[PDB]
Design a protein around this ligand. Structure first.
Ligand SMILES: Nc1nc2c(ncn2[C@@H]2O[C@H](COP(=O)(O)OP(=O)(O)NP(=O)(O)O)[C@@H](O)[C@H]2O)c(=O)[nH]1
Ligand SMILES: Nc1nc2c(ncn2[C@@H]2O[C@H](COP(=O)(O)OP(=O)(O)NP(=O)(O)O)[C@@H](O)[C@H]2O)c(=O)[nH]1
Ligand SMILES: [Mg+2]
Ligand SMILES: [Mg+2]
Lengths: 168, 168
Protein backbone atom coordinates (compact mmCIF):
# COMPACT_ATOMS: atom_id res chain seq x y z
CA UNK A 1 0.00 0.00 0.00
CA UNK A 2 1.19 3.52 0.81
CA UNK A 3 2.71 5.21 3.88
CA UNK A 4 2.68 8.99 4.33
CA UNK A 5 5.92 10.11 5.98
CA UNK A 6 6.94 13.58 7.19
CA UNK A 7 10.36 15.03 7.93
CA UNK A 8 10.32 17.93 10.41
CA UNK A 9 12.97 19.85 12.34
CA UNK A 10 14.83 23.14 12.35
CA UNK A 11 15.99 24.73 9.11
CA UNK A 12 19.46 23.45 8.27
CA UNK A 13 19.50 20.11 10.12
CA UNK A 14 19.58 18.15 6.86
CA UNK A 15 16.03 16.98 6.18
CA UNK A 16 16.32 17.58 2.44
CA UNK A 17 19.77 16.00 2.24
CA UNK A 18 18.63 12.83 4.00
CA UNK A 19 15.76 12.60 1.56
CA UNK A 20 17.86 13.26 -1.56
CA UNK A 21 20.54 10.84 -0.35
CA UNK A 22 17.89 8.15 0.22
CA UNK A 23 15.89 8.59 -2.99
CA UNK A 24 18.69 9.64 -5.39
CA UNK A 25 21.89 8.63 -3.55
CA UNK A 26 23.34 12.14 -3.91
CA UNK A 27 24.40 14.85 -1.49
CA UNK A 28 24.17 18.62 -1.98
CA UNK A 29 27.01 20.40 -0.12
CA UNK A 30 25.15 23.67 -0.62
CA UNK A 31 22.26 24.94 1.47
CA UNK A 32 19.12 25.14 -0.69
CA UNK A 33 16.37 25.90 1.81
CA UNK A 34 12.93 24.29 1.35
CA UNK A 35 10.02 26.63 0.58
CA UNK A 36 6.90 25.49 2.45
CA UNK A 37 7.02 21.80 1.59
CA UNK A 38 8.38 19.28 -0.92
CA UNK A 39 7.19 15.81 -1.90
CA UNK A 40 8.98 12.65 -3.11
CA UNK A 41 8.35 8.91 -3.34
CA UNK A 42 10.19 5.59 -3.28
CA UNK A 43 9.21 1.94 -3.22
CA UNK A 44 10.54 -0.12 -0.32
CA UNK A 45 10.11 -3.84 0.31
CA UNK A 46 8.90 -4.80 3.75
CA UNK A 47 9.47 -8.53 4.11
CA UNK A 48 8.23 -9.34 0.61
CA UNK A 49 5.62 -6.56 0.66
CA UNK A 50 6.39 -3.72 -1.75
CA UNK A 51 5.37 -0.47 -0.05
CA UNK A 52 5.27 3.02 -1.54
CA UNK A 53 6.60 5.77 0.69
CA UNK A 54 5.31 9.28 0.05
CA UNK A 55 7.96 11.45 1.68
CA UNK A 56 6.98 14.99 2.66
CA UNK A 57 10.04 17.20 3.11
CA UNK A 58 8.93 20.21 5.18
CA UNK A 59 10.42 23.68 5.57
CA UNK A 60 12.32 24.32 8.77
CA UNK A 61 12.02 28.10 8.42
CA UNK A 62 9.63 29.64 10.97
CA UNK A 63 7.58 31.53 8.36
CA UNK A 64 6.89 28.39 6.29
CA UNK A 65 5.97 26.26 9.32
CA UNK A 66 2.24 27.00 9.22
CA UNK A 67 1.98 25.34 5.81
CA UNK A 68 3.47 22.29 7.48
CA UNK A 69 1.37 21.78 10.62
CA UNK A 70 -1.52 21.34 8.19
CA UNK A 71 0.13 18.18 6.78
CA UNK A 72 0.60 16.63 10.26
CA UNK A 73 -2.87 15.13 10.49
CA UNK A 74 -2.85 12.07 8.26
CA UNK A 75 0.85 11.26 8.46
CA UNK A 76 1.63 7.60 9.27
CA UNK A 77 5.25 8.35 10.15
CA UNK A 78 7.03 11.46 11.43
CA UNK A 79 10.80 11.90 11.55
CA UNK A 80 12.08 14.60 13.88
CA UNK A 81 15.58 15.61 12.87
CA UNK A 82 18.15 17.72 14.69
CA UNK A 83 21.79 18.64 13.94
CA UNK A 84 24.38 17.12 16.34
CA UNK A 85 26.65 20.08 15.63
CA UNK A 86 23.94 22.55 16.66
CA UNK A 87 22.72 22.34 20.25
CA UNK A 88 19.85 24.74 19.56
CA UNK A 89 18.25 22.41 16.99
CA UNK A 90 18.35 19.57 19.58
CA UNK A 91 16.80 21.59 22.41
CA UNK A 92 14.09 22.59 19.94
CA UNK A 93 13.05 18.95 19.46
CA UNK A 94 10.85 19.19 22.55
CA UNK A 95 8.80 21.97 20.92
CA UNK A 96 8.61 19.98 17.69
CA UNK A 97 7.36 17.05 19.76
CA UNK A 98 4.52 19.14 21.25
CA UNK A 99 3.52 20.46 17.84
CA UNK A 100 3.31 16.85 16.59
CA UNK A 101 1.02 15.71 19.43
CA UNK A 102 -1.35 18.58 18.72
CA UNK A 103 -1.68 17.70 15.06
CA UNK A 104 -0.68 14.08 14.33
CA UNK A 105 -2.86 10.96 14.48
CA UNK A 106 -2.71 8.62 17.45
CA UNK A 107 -1.18 5.74 15.50
CA UNK A 108 1.52 7.96 13.95
CA UNK A 109 4.97 6.41 14.40
CA UNK A 110 7.70 8.85 15.44
CA UNK A 111 11.49 8.59 15.15
CA UNK A 112 14.21 10.91 16.41
CA UNK A 113 17.26 11.43 14.17
CA UNK A 114 20.53 13.06 15.12
CA UNK A 115 22.00 13.96 11.73
CA UNK A 116 25.53 14.90 10.60
CA UNK A 117 27.31 12.24 12.67
CA UNK A 118 30.21 12.73 10.25
CA UNK A 119 31.17 16.08 11.84
CA UNK A 120 34.05 16.41 14.28
CA UNK A 121 32.36 19.58 15.46
CA UNK A 122 29.63 17.56 17.22
CA UNK A 123 28.26 19.19 20.35
CA UNK A 124 25.35 16.85 21.08
CA UNK A 125 26.48 13.38 22.21
CA UNK A 126 24.83 10.12 21.18
CA UNK A 127 23.98 9.53 24.83
CA UNK A 128 22.21 12.90 24.99
CA UNK A 129 20.07 11.93 22.01
CA UNK A 130 19.30 8.52 23.46
CA UNK A 131 18.28 10.22 26.70
CA UNK A 132 15.99 12.67 24.92
CA UNK A 133 14.57 9.71 23.00
CA UNK A 134 13.83 7.72 26.18
CA UNK A 135 12.13 10.77 27.70
CA UNK A 136 9.90 11.34 24.66
CA UNK A 137 9.16 7.64 24.33
CA UNK A 138 10.32 7.32 20.72
CA UNK A 139 13.08 5.41 18.86
CA UNK A 140 16.44 6.95 18.13
CA UNK A 141 19.14 6.81 15.50
CA UNK A 142 22.08 8.93 14.35
CA UNK A 143 22.80 9.52 10.68
CA UNK A 144 24.95 11.26 8.11
CA UNK A 145 23.42 12.21 4.79
CA UNK A 146 26.92 13.11 3.67
CA UNK A 147 28.81 9.88 4.40
CA UNK A 148 25.57 7.95 3.94
CA UNK A 149 25.46 6.30 7.38
CA UNK A 150 22.14 5.03 8.71
CA UNK A 151 20.28 7.00 6.04
CA UNK A 152 18.40 3.99 4.60
CA UNK A 153 17.97 2.60 8.10
CA UNK A 154 16.00 5.69 9.04
CA UNK A 155 13.37 4.99 6.42
CA UNK A 156 13.44 1.20 6.50
CA UNK A 157 13.01 1.01 10.28
CA UNK A 158 10.21 3.61 10.32
CA UNK A 159 8.37 1.71 7.58
CA UNK A 160 8.81 -1.59 9.44
CA UNK A 161 7.45 0.01 12.61
CA UNK A 162 4.43 1.41 10.78
CA UNK A 163 3.86 -1.93 9.03
CA UNK A 164 4.12 -3.87 12.30
CA UNK A 165 1.49 -1.44 13.51
CA UNK A 166 -0.73 -2.21 10.51
CA UNK A 167 -0.82 -5.81 11.75
CA UNK A 168 -3.00 -5.27 14.82
CA UNK B 1 4.77 38.72 20.26
CA UNK B 2 5.39 42.45 20.63
CA UNK B 3 7.61 43.82 23.37
CA UNK B 4 7.56 47.59 23.84
CA UNK B 5 10.92 48.74 25.24
CA UNK B 6 11.99 52.23 26.40
CA UNK B 7 15.46 53.70 26.89
CA UNK B 8 15.57 56.54 29.38
CA UNK B 9 18.33 58.47 31.10
CA UNK B 10 20.14 61.80 30.99
CA UNK B 11 21.07 63.44 27.71
CA UNK B 12 24.47 62.21 26.57
CA UNK B 13 24.67 58.84 28.36
CA UNK B 14 24.51 56.90 25.11
CA UNK B 15 20.91 55.74 24.70
CA UNK B 16 20.87 56.37 20.95
CA UNK B 17 24.32 54.85 20.40
CA UNK B 18 23.42 51.64 22.22
CA UNK B 19 20.32 51.44 20.04
CA UNK B 20 22.13 52.15 16.76
CA UNK B 21 24.93 49.74 17.71
CA UNK B 22 22.37 47.02 18.45
CA UNK B 23 20.11 47.47 15.42
CA UNK B 24 22.69 48.58 12.81
CA UNK B 25 26.03 47.59 14.37
CA UNK B 26 27.41 51.13 13.94
CA UNK B 27 28.63 53.82 16.32
CA UNK B 28 28.33 57.59 15.89
CA UNK B 29 31.29 59.39 17.53
CA UNK B 30 29.37 62.64 17.22
CA UNK B 31 26.65 63.84 19.56
CA UNK B 32 23.32 64.03 17.68
CA UNK B 33 20.79 64.70 20.42
CA UNK B 34 17.34 63.06 20.20
CA UNK B 35 14.35 65.36 19.73
CA UNK B 36 11.41 64.18 21.86
CA UNK B 37 11.53 60.49 20.95
CA UNK B 38 12.70 58.05 18.29
CA UNK B 39 11.44 54.57 17.35
CA UNK B 40 13.15 51.45 15.94
CA UNK B 41 12.56 47.70 15.75
CA UNK B 42 14.45 44.41 15.58
CA UNK B 43 13.50 40.75 15.65
CA UNK B 44 15.06 38.93 18.55
CA UNK B 45 15.07 35.18 19.18
CA UNK B 46 14.49 34.28 22.82
CA UNK B 47 15.09 30.52 23.10
CA UNK B 48 13.88 29.62 19.62
CA UNK B 49 11.02 32.09 20.02
CA UNK B 50 11.39 35.01 17.58
CA UNK B 51 10.02 38.21 19.12
CA UNK B 52 9.71 41.73 17.70
CA UNK B 53 11.20 44.50 19.81
CA UNK B 54 9.80 48.01 19.35
CA UNK B 55 12.55 50.19 20.76
CA UNK B 56 11.60 53.68 21.91
CA UNK B 57 14.68 55.92 22.14
CA UNK B 58 13.70 58.87 24.33
CA UNK B 59 15.21 62.34 24.63
CA UNK B 60 17.34 62.99 27.69
CA UNK B 61 16.97 66.75 27.41
CA UNK B 62 14.79 68.23 30.18
CA UNK B 63 12.49 70.13 27.80
CA UNK B 64 11.39 66.88 26.12
CA UNK B 65 10.92 64.88 29.30
CA UNK B 66 7.16 65.48 29.06
CA UNK B 67 6.79 63.98 25.59
CA UNK B 68 8.44 60.90 27.06
CA UNK B 69 6.67 60.28 30.39
CA UNK B 70 3.57 59.86 28.23
CA UNK B 71 5.15 56.75 26.63
CA UNK B 72 5.90 55.13 30.01
CA UNK B 73 2.48 53.58 30.54
CA UNK B 74 2.34 50.56 28.26
CA UNK B 75 6.05 49.78 28.15
CA UNK B 76 6.94 46.15 28.98
CA UNK B 77 10.65 46.86 29.41
CA UNK B 78 12.46 50.02 30.56
CA UNK B 79 16.23 50.53 30.38
CA UNK B 80 17.65 53.20 32.67
CA UNK B 81 21.05 54.24 31.33
CA UNK B 82 23.75 56.37 32.94
CA UNK B 83 27.31 57.33 31.92
CA UNK B 84 30.10 55.85 34.09
CA UNK B 85 32.26 58.87 33.24
CA UNK B 86 29.59 61.26 34.52
CA UNK B 87 28.69 61.00 38.21
CA UNK B 88 25.74 63.35 37.80
CA UNK B 89 24.00 61.05 35.31
CA UNK B 90 24.35 58.17 37.84
CA UNK B 91 23.00 60.14 40.83
CA UNK B 92 20.05 61.11 38.64
CA UNK B 93 19.06 57.47 38.19
CA UNK B 94 17.13 57.66 41.46
CA UNK B 95 14.92 60.42 40.06
CA UNK B 96 14.47 58.47 36.82
CA UNK B 97 13.42 55.48 38.92
CA UNK B 98 10.69 57.51 40.69
CA UNK B 99 9.41 58.87 37.39
CA UNK B 100 9.13 55.29 36.12
CA UNK B 101 7.10 54.07 39.13
CA UNK B 102 4.65 56.93 38.65
CA UNK B 103 4.04 56.10 35.00
CA UNK B 104 4.99 52.52 34.13
CA UNK B 105 2.88 49.36 34.45
CA UNK B 106 3.30 46.98 37.35
CA UNK B 107 4.69 44.15 35.21
CA UNK B 108 7.23 46.42 33.50
CA UNK B 109 10.71 44.89 33.65
CA UNK B 110 13.50 47.37 34.47
CA UNK B 111 17.26 47.17 33.86
CA UNK B 112 20.06 49.50 34.94
CA UNK B 113 22.89 50.08 32.47
CA UNK B 114 26.21 51.75 33.13
CA UNK B 115 27.36 52.74 29.65
CA UNK B 116 30.80 53.73 28.28
CA UNK B 117 32.78 51.05 30.14
CA UNK B 118 35.45 51.64 27.50
CA UNK B 119 36.49 54.98 29.05
CA UNK B 120 39.58 55.33 31.21
CA UNK B 121 37.95 58.48 32.58
CA UNK B 122 35.43 56.35 34.52
CA UNK B 123 34.29 57.94 37.80
CA UNK B 124 31.46 55.56 38.76
CA UNK B 125 32.75 52.08 39.69
CA UNK B 126 31.05 48.81 38.76
CA UNK B 127 30.51 48.13 42.46
CA UNK B 128 28.73 51.47 42.80
CA UNK B 129 26.35 50.53 40.02
CA UNK B 130 25.78 47.09 41.49
CA UNK B 131 24.97 48.73 44.82
CA UNK B 132 22.51 51.16 43.26
CA UNK B 133 20.97 48.21 41.44
CA UNK B 134 20.55 46.17 44.64
CA UNK B 135 18.94 49.17 46.34
CA UNK B 136 16.47 49.75 43.51
CA UNK B 137 15.75 46.04 43.18
CA UNK B 138 16.61 45.78 39.50
CA UNK B 139 19.19 43.92 37.38
CA UNK B 140 22.47 45.55 36.40
CA UNK B 141 24.95 45.45 33.56
CA UNK B 142 27.76 47.65 32.21
CA UNK B 143 28.16 48.30 28.51
CA UNK B 144 30.06 50.10 25.79
CA UNK B 145 28.22 51.08 22.62
CA UNK B 146 31.61 52.03 21.22
CA UNK B 147 33.61 48.83 21.72
CA UNK B 148 30.37 46.86 21.50
CA UNK B 149 30.56 45.20 24.93
CA UNK B 150 27.39 43.83 26.52
CA UNK B 151 25.29 45.79 24.03
CA UNK B 152 23.30 42.84 22.69
CA UNK B 153 23.21 41.36 26.21
CA UNK B 154 21.28 44.41 27.38
CA UNK B 155 18.43 43.72 24.99
CA UNK B 156 18.56 39.92 25.00
CA UNK B 157 18.46 39.68 28.78
CA UNK B 158 15.64 42.23 29.09
CA UNK B 159 13.60 40.33 26.49
CA UNK B 160 14.24 37.02 28.29
CA UNK B 161 13.14 38.55 31.59
CA UNK B 162 9.96 39.94 30.01
CA UNK B 163 9.29 36.63 28.25
CA UNK B 164 9.84 34.65 31.47
CA UNK B 165 7.27 37.01 32.93
CA UNK B 166 4.97 36.19 29.98
CA UNK B 167 5.05 32.39 30.30
CA UNK B 168 3.26 33.13 33.57
N1 LIG C 1 28.50 17.48 7.17
C1 LIG C 1 27.21 17.32 6.88
N2 LIG C 1 26.49 18.32 6.34
C2 LIG C 1 25.19 17.99 6.10
C3 LIG C 1 24.56 16.78 6.34
N3 LIG C 1 23.22 16.84 5.96
C4 LIG C 1 23.09 18.03 5.52
N4 LIG C 1 24.24 18.82 5.57
C5 LIG C 1 24.42 20.26 5.14
O1 LIG C 1 23.64 21.11 6.01
C6 LIG C 1 23.03 22.18 5.23
C7 LIG C 1 21.49 22.11 5.34
O2 LIG C 1 20.99 20.86 4.76
P1 LIG C 1 19.53 20.71 4.20
O3 LIG C 1 19.26 19.27 3.91
O4 LIG C 1 19.31 21.71 3.11
O5 LIG C 1 18.70 21.17 5.57
P2 LIG C 1 17.12 21.26 5.75
O6 LIG C 1 16.79 20.67 7.06
O7 LIG C 1 16.50 20.49 4.65
N5 LIG C 1 16.80 22.88 5.66
P3 LIG C 1 15.37 23.60 5.41
O8 LIG C 1 14.32 23.27 6.55
O9 LIG C 1 15.53 25.05 5.37
O10 LIG C 1 14.69 23.13 4.20
C8 LIG C 1 23.49 22.00 3.76
O11 LIG C 1 24.60 22.89 3.45
C9 LIG C 1 23.88 20.53 3.73
O12 LIG C 1 24.87 20.20 2.73
C10 LIG C 1 25.31 15.71 6.90
O13 LIG C 1 24.92 14.57 7.18
N6 LIG C 1 26.65 16.08 7.14
N1 LIG D 1 33.46 56.42 24.49
C1 LIG D 1 32.14 56.24 24.33
N2 LIG D 1 31.35 57.25 23.87
C2 LIG D 1 30.03 56.90 23.77
C3 LIG D 1 29.45 55.69 24.08
N3 LIG D 1 28.09 55.73 23.85
C4 LIG D 1 27.87 56.92 23.42
N4 LIG D 1 28.99 57.71 23.34
C5 LIG D 1 29.09 59.13 22.90
O1 LIG D 1 28.25 59.93 23.74
C6 LIG D 1 27.69 61.03 22.97
C7 LIG D 1 26.18 61.03 23.04
O2 LIG D 1 25.67 59.72 22.78
P1 LIG D 1 24.17 59.54 22.40
O3 LIG D 1 23.94 58.10 22.06
O4 LIG D 1 23.75 60.59 21.42
O5 LIG D 1 23.53 59.94 23.87
P2 LIG D 1 21.98 60.05 24.25
O6 LIG D 1 21.80 59.41 25.58
O7 LIG D 1 21.22 59.32 23.20
N5 LIG D 1 21.70 61.66 24.25
P3 LIG D 1 20.25 62.36 24.11
O8 LIG D 1 19.30 61.94 25.32
O9 LIG D 1 20.35 63.81 24.13
O10 LIG D 1 19.53 61.91 22.94
C8 LIG D 1 28.22 60.88 21.51
O11 LIG D 1 29.37 61.75 21.28
C9 LIG D 1 28.60 59.39 21.48
O12 LIG D 1 29.61 59.05 20.51
C10 LIG D 1 30.27 54.63 24.56
O13 LIG D 1 29.93 53.50 24.87
N6 LIG D 1 31.63 54.99 24.65
MG1 LIG E 1 15.17 21.30 3.24
MG1 LIG F 1 19.65 60.12 21.98
Amino acid sequence: SIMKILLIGDSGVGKSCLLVRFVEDKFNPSFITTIGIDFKIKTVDINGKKVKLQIWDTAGQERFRTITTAYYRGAMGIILVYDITDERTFTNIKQWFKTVNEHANDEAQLLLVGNKSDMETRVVTADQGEALAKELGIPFIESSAKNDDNVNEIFFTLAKLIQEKIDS
